[PDB]
Design a protein around this ligand. Structure first.
Ligand SMILES: Cc1cc2c(cc1C)N(C[C@H](O)[C@H](O)[C@H](O)COP(=O)(O)O)c1[nH]c(=O)[nH]c(=O)c1N2
Ligand SMILES: Cc1cc2c(cc1C)N(C[C@H](O)[C@H](O)[C@H](O)COP(=O)(O)O)c1[nH]c(=O)[nH]c(=O)c1N2
Ligand SMILES: [Mn+2]
Ligand SMILES: [Mn+2]
Ligand SMILES: [Mn+2]
Ligand SMILES: [Mn+2]
Lengths: 118, 298, 298, 118
């Protein structure tokens, strides 16, 4: 299954390279026409990056789940971009992880997506 | 001579971090800490000494970052928008340092506070820890610095922002996660919110300079970065031994130190060097506070 | 090494100025300037060029004060509370500089703005004016400075804060006192409110150092202070000639320059050197704005 | 007539020495038991210094007028300590002047007080 993602300072990009899954970085024009999982980072005060928001306006019909990278220093705003996308589009939160993720984060993600894809 | 022009962006990051700085603006008058004394009198003597000692140590580190770290790095930057962000971050280091005095005023008498600051000034371990960091800053006190000297000063600064504070942050978070000294914990959380974005920003700047170094200089700073990390780690272990042995928390703090060392490395774009363990669940509870979502712009 | 302790005062002034800084905190998002274009299109071409040129010159001066002036003075201060105040004042210099870009965005296109900043960078008169001031700052880029070097850098800074800005501040105040570009005038007034207390504070610090100089060094810095004042005055007269001849305001601005030079001298505790004349009554009207009473703490 | 005054950074003190009038700096304990003119500086946002406020609580029965030093950079808050004292205690504003005052400020003051003292 396809993974769509966005990264500003490289942490999500590094997480992606641990997954060994088909993955593509989003831009403003990109159109995905098959089921995908979104991985976004968290910016602002628990907010979704604007480029991810714009991308989802065109592509939310094929969105099946969301993970978020963040930092537990943000308290209840940890990975809260996932919560906002999950409630907005009624898709599950796949997982939340810190920065580039641990090896347990990787395996938890792959187990969660195999669970979802049925 | 160049004036700063914010209508033409010098990089892809400075404007967003400028705005975030200001949205996170806060001052100690916003948090009253007097209600903390109800739980402060419930702590044992050994617990109170540990708490006053870690705050003194944090005050020292913020003093050096606001008065040496940010000003000497920013004066040598050519990017005028990034320079602006660092000047504001340096001002917030002084707000942090002052906020620890606001906590002390409530918890201790005038004479207790002087004793703690005497202890900080003369403690050989704090002197060595602070001296290692600021020796990278003092190299920059000359008209021309090399990119290698500026890179190593940014590494030193990230290691302070993202790593060296946390042997001290541990204990206020540990208590607040148990419902003790929660007003003071709110201030510590506002501080941590600032340091989290400080470390990211200086890490970005360091990575831009790294790409401008020659192949040989990249190899040199990579080795020196690893030696500095481990040198500071040896010092942190001696420090946590001195502070936390009496209250039985040495192993817990050391785990938390390695956990944040890995974050500091990732801020520089480097791979973690310590084994991955999950955060102490009580510390994690202490990081949940309603005050952290306050936006100045609202 | 010493940590800053705000529960024991290091001087009689730093705490009051720390609090005043923060009470005066503001950011450009608080003042919308788009309504100014209704009166901006009523100005002649020569009036618009003069306005864009003075703002470019102000942007340059604030850039140097935030990126060189405050950080290099504060790094050599031993008073940790005064150091804290200067770090915050340096951050506000960056807020000032950014606020001029907020004005430009409204009044000029992208290409107009680049042209103005090209003009600023390459103007020989601005280069010489800024170069004289910052040559006192760059002396401090070494590990040890003498009290005489630090005193002369503070004199340079007061002359900038209290005197050199005002050949530029004159014109936005002159227009706003006539009901033109009044939103921009509000921002200029918020800037002036900050610079007024910046110049007082650095003047206090300079006077404390003066009393520590030997009799011979006091005589030396007194002579050098007078030569610097007059050297800058010669430059200001050439500058006002270049900027204001086309709009017939040269004599008015020169009077306003001497008026503020006297205030800068008084901030250092020295007697005025120019004849006493009253402020231009239209400029005085431009200094009346309801925005100047805004207290952050309320 | 006696002049009572307060100064933080010396400007009012220097104005006083131009007057050649009997003058005394105020402190917390000071009690004046004869008519006086007060000269204060302006602090804060057009505010009266706290030491002057405390002094006036004990000594306002003998207050006959007030002058204020300030800076016209403060707009409508220029010398506004005088306005607050004038309305609080129903005494005239003698004059407002900038920093250490001009020679015209000195002569205007001395003319104003001779006017008041009748
Ligand atoms: C300005 C700003 C603001 C925030 C963050 C960072 C920055 C710079 N980050 C942390 C961020 O999400 C984390 O570093 C991610 O790993 C960033 O991912 P990329 O490296 O951009 O893929 C963050 N994390 C979180 O869990 N909650 C939050 O509210 C924020 N807010
Ligand atoms: C923090 C702060 C605040 C203010 C001032 C100064 C400072 C430092 N000053 C200017 C002040 O009144 C002027 O410099 C006087 O001359 C000070 O007199 P001394 O030098 O203390 O006698 C001032 N002046 C004024 O006319 N209105 C005001 O609101 C203020 N506010
Ligand atoms: Mn800090
Ligand atoms: Mn910091
Ligand atoms: Mn300024
Ligand atoms: Mn200034």
């Amino acid at each position: 299954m396809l993974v769509a993602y966005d990264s500003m300072t490289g942490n999500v990009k590094r997480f992606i390279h641990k997954l060994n899954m088909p993955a593509v970085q989003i831009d403003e024009d990109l159109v995905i026409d098959e089921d995908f999982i979104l991985i976004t980072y968290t910016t602002g005060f628990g907010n979704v990056p604007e480029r991810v928001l714009d991308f989802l306006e065109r592509n939310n019909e094929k969105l099946k789940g969301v993970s978020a990278s963040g930092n537990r220093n943000w308290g209840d705003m940890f990975g809260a971009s996932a919560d906002k996308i999950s409630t907005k589009y009624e898709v599950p939160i796949v997982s939340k992880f810190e920065l580039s993720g641990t090896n347990n984060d990787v395996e938890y993600f792959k187990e969660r997506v195999r669970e979802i894809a049925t | 001579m160049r004036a700063v022009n914010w209508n033409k962006k010098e990089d892809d990051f400075s404007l967003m971090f400028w705005k975030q700085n200001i949205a996170q603006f806060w001052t100690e008058e916003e948090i009253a800490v007097s209600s903390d004394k109800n739980t402060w009198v419930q702590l044992s003597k050994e617990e109170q000494i540990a708490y006053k000692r870690v705050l003194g140590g944090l005050t020292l580190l913020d003093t050096k970052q606001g008065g040496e770290g940010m000003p000497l790095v920013l004066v040598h930057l050519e990017n005028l928008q990034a320079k602006s962000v660092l000047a504001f971050m340096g001002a917030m280091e002084e707000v942090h340092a002052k906020s620890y005095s606001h906590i002390f005023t409530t918890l201790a008498t005038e004479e207790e506070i002087d004793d703690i600051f005497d202890w900080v000034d003369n403690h050989p371990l704090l002197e060595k820890k602070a001296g290692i960091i600021t020796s990278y800053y003092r190299r920059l006190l000359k008209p021309e610095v090399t990119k290698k000297e500026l890179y190593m000063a940014m590494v030193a600064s990230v290691f302070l922002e993202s790593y060296l504070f946390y042997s001290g942050f541990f204990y206020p978070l540990y208590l607040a996660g148990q419902g003790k000294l929660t007003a003071s914990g709110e201030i510590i959380n506002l501080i941590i919110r600032d340091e989290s974005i400080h470390g990211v920003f200086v890490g970005i700047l360091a990575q831009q300079i790294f790409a401008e170094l020659s192949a040989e200089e990249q190899q040199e700073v990579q080795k020196e970065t690893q030696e500095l990390l481990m040198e500071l780690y040896e010092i942190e272990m001696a420090y946590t031994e001195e502070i936390y042995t009496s209250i039985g928390l040495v192993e817990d703090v050391n785990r938390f130190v390695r956990y944040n060392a890995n974050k500091g490395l990732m801020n520089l774009g480097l791979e973690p060097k310590f084994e991955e363990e999950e955060i102490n669940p009580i510390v994690l509870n202490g990081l949940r506070t309603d005050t952290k979502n306050h936006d100045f712009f609202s």
